[PDB]
Amino acid sequence: ADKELKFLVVDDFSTMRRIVRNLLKELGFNNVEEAEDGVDALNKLQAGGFGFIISDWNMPNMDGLELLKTIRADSAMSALPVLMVTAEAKKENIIAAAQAGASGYVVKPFTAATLEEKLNKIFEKLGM
């Protein structure tokens, strides 16, 4: 998929944000912005431009699940790719995230190799 694509990395922890950010750089994706919760995320999303969301699951204010749901209910943002990040591959989550239209799923901690999979998977499902 196109390299100039604009990412939004959403996580309450800045280290996780910086990890994901650098992993994306490694795979040749340099256009990344950050947010610390769902509300922060939504606020930046409404500036337009973004083509992919990587979101943490557990966040005060508005967790990733609520965020994803808001994106899907949003007329302009409904189709946006959203990869959900979680600390546990709990069956219930994977379902929850599926129900809500999560494009993909990943457990932290995760390697660059692992991220390349998930992104590519997403890209081939949607035609990016």
């Binding site: 994977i94 379902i95 599926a98 993909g104 799923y105």
Partner: peptide, 8 residues
């Protein structure tokens, strides 16, 4: 079994 079926 779940992850796969879902395209995850």
């Amino acid at each position: 079994d779940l992850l796969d079926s879902l395209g995850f």
